[PDB]
């Protein structure tokens, strides 16, 4: 059954659509005749339009508000099948050329939405008396229902398809459903068809790039939620639309909004914060530099030759995560903070300066720089630092701007425990505390691979021994809330799905 969402385009992309999961936006010849059931609205804007097979209007959108049947200014528009517009209201308005329509009532075709049922210009329905209204009410709606209330897999009417995942009390665990069925439109499919990618709600949609990301964890592409920023390459300074550009220009800063892996070389150069005259770029508002903070890789050479002075750390690249120098500025430098005014270099996560060497010079007020051990940062043996001319090391130590002693000897890119390459003790996420909440601590976490792992929150902290050994409430030692078999859980399963979607009482 073909599907769709200029007149020629819509007539070719709507002609054979046996069902359209989008909207029936027929605006402005007899190209539609077998549009069976539509999960959405119908923007009818035209005098002879068959539309005969239009059976169910779901109003999943509305023109302005509950406007499922928007009409205007079609006596031979025999919507005889248009018998039940569900979850919507009929805006059957501006019917000047419509005949045989006033005689037929306009209310039995909608249910419990007569409040928004406005219409203005037993009884036959459409053009030609051969058609009748065929009242059936005064779960089928189109008259083993022909059109189901919510989901009709093959012939049955079901409110909801068989889930892709069905709990296994045999595993004492909420498992997948062997009869797993994605709900394509209104029919359940074992395999998500139409090159459609499984979506969060399960209704495979052909586009879930919003607030999510596509994944392929099986033979079918799936849309996964966007972890932080999800991947979104953007051409960088030097390559692509900015190929001639000389910096992150202000007329260039915005287009990198939510740019994940800037593919060129970000090179924020002094003219930029100065703003340039010959290139016509207004001054980049110093707060706007926060845009690039979503950066998570910079496949080029980042020569950041000034940042706003009122900020004491290069906080704007506080997510730079690999600085692979596919090109290297002067072929020798990969991370090149040169003559800034930053207190600590502070690039809090850069843990693979892949290609070039790193020169961090001129930083007259950068102190935590020297203690960093750049060998673990360099990725190839030809990398060699030149971290020079910084703030005086002896003066730094005298002034006390030395790393938190809760930091391992490898150094630290900034004074706060956030900026420390590795810790003397283990770490609780970004920072690195003295001690995990092994017995005392509200988070009551668990140490894992020199890292504090906050417990499954559904687990009570324990005051005699360690609270929870490992991740997952299965690993939780204390669960004052209910515990599900050998696992702890929020609450017991009752409205669960079973062999035939049976509500598993489980235990009390």
């Amino acid at each position, epitope marked *: 059954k073909k599907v769709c969402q200029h007149f020629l385009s819509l007539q070719r992309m709507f002609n054979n659509c046996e069902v359209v999961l989008g909207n029936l936006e027929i605006t402005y010849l007899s190209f539609l005749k077998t549009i069976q059931e539509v999960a959405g609205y119908v923007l009818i804007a035209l005098e002879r339009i068959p539309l005969e097979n239009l059976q169910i209007i779901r109003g999943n959108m509305y023109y302005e508000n509950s406007y499922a049947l928007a009409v205007l200014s079609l006596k031979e528009l025999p919507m005889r099948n248009l018998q039940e517009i569900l979850h919507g209201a009929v805006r059957f308005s501006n019917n000047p050329a419509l005949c045989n329509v006033e005689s037929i009532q306009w209310r039995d075709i909608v249910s419990s939405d007569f409040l928004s049922n406005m219409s203005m210009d037993g009884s036959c329905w459409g053009a030609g008396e051969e058609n009748c209204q065929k009242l059936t009410k005064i779960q089928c709606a189109a008259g083993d229902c022909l059109v189901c209330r919510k989901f009709r897999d093959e012939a049955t009417c079901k409110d909801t398809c068989p889930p892709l995942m069905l709990y296994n009390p045999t595993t004492y665990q909420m498992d997948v459903n062997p009869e797993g069925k994605y709900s394509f439109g209104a029919t359940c499919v074992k395999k998500c068809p139409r090159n459609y990618v499984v979506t969060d709600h399960g209704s495979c949609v052909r586009a879930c790039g919003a607030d999510s990301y596509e994944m392929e964890e099986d033979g079918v592409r799936k849309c996964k939620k966007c972890e932080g920023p999800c991947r979104k390459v953007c051409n960088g300074i030097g390559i692509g639309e900015f190929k001639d550009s*000389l910096s992150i220009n202000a007329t260039n800063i915005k287009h990198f909004k939510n740019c994940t892996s800037i593919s060129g070389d970000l090179h924020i150069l002094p003219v930029a914060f100065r703003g340039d005259s*010959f290139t*016509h770029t207004p001054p980049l508002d110093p707060q706007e530099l926060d845009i690039l903070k979503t950066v998570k890789e910079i496949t080029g050479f980042l020569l950041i030759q000034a940042w706003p002075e009122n900020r004491t750390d290069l906080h704007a690249f506080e997510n730079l995560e690999i600085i692979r120098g596919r090109t290297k500025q002067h072929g020798q430098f990969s991370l090149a903070v040169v003559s800034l005014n930053i207190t600590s270099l502070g690039l809090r996560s850069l843990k693979e300066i892949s290609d070039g060497d790193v020169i961090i010079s001129g930083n007259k007020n950068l102190c935590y720089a020297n203690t960093i051990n750049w060998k673990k940062l360099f990725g190839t043996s030809g990398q060699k630092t030149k971290i020079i001319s910084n703030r005086g090391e002896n003066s730094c130590k005298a002034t006390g701007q030395v790393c938190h002693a809760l930091c391992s000897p490898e150094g630290c890119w900034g004074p706060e425990p956030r900026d420390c390459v590795s810790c003397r003790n283990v770490s609780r996420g970004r920072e690195c505390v003295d001690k995990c909440n092994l017995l005392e601590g509200e988070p009551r976490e668990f140490v894992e691979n020199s890292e504090c792992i906050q417990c499954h929150p559904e687990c009570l902290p324990q005051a005699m021994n360690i609270t929870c050994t490992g991740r997952g409430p299965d690993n939780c030692i204390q669960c004052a809330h209910y515990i599900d078999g050998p696992h702890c859980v929020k609450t017991c399963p009752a409205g669960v799905m079973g062999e035939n979607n049976t509500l598993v009482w489980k235990y009390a």
Partner: single-chain antibody
Amino acid sequence: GSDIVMTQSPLSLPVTPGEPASISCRSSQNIVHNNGITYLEWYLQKPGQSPQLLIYKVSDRFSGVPDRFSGSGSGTDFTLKISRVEAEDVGVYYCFQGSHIPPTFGQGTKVEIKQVQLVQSGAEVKKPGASVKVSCKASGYTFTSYWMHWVRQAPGQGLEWMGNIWPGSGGTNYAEKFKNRVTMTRDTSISTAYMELSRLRSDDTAVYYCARSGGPYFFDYWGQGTLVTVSS
């Protein structure tokens, strides 16, 4: 399209001191850039002196430019007001355009009566078809941090932007009128910018004032200027 004609209404208007001078120039098209800033100026060159900028944009003022100068304009018509005129104001005020890709200096109203320093090189005379490399030494600013665009001022004709070079990377953005004759290189090492104009022609005789292209004001601070008269 080749040159947003910057006609200026008065020409060589001579003015008695202490008078409300007003010099209008009209741009052959709308000088209204996609950024929306009307990147206009009116840079002054005192007799026998380098061009210096006067009104930072259409009506702001350059730091150090006395408020005695003012100006106004919109669309394609713009004009500058000199409420009080002294000996200092005497000279030619030249209206440069900005939204159009090629900077293009207008006719020029010669007003009459009715630190970082970039050193240019010294006066040279070459012969037709030859080449002159007029140098531009730079100090007081990071030479590879302000594009050293190099205007040219024909005798008996107005300024015309010739090309730029972001001393950092050796980029050149040559102008069309000289597009196959000029070559702008730089030695960031020695903090001097060279510009070798090869195949010199009879009308090429001009003083290559080598200014430093600015942030919100184009052609900020200028060099002495290296005149090169070439005759046949």
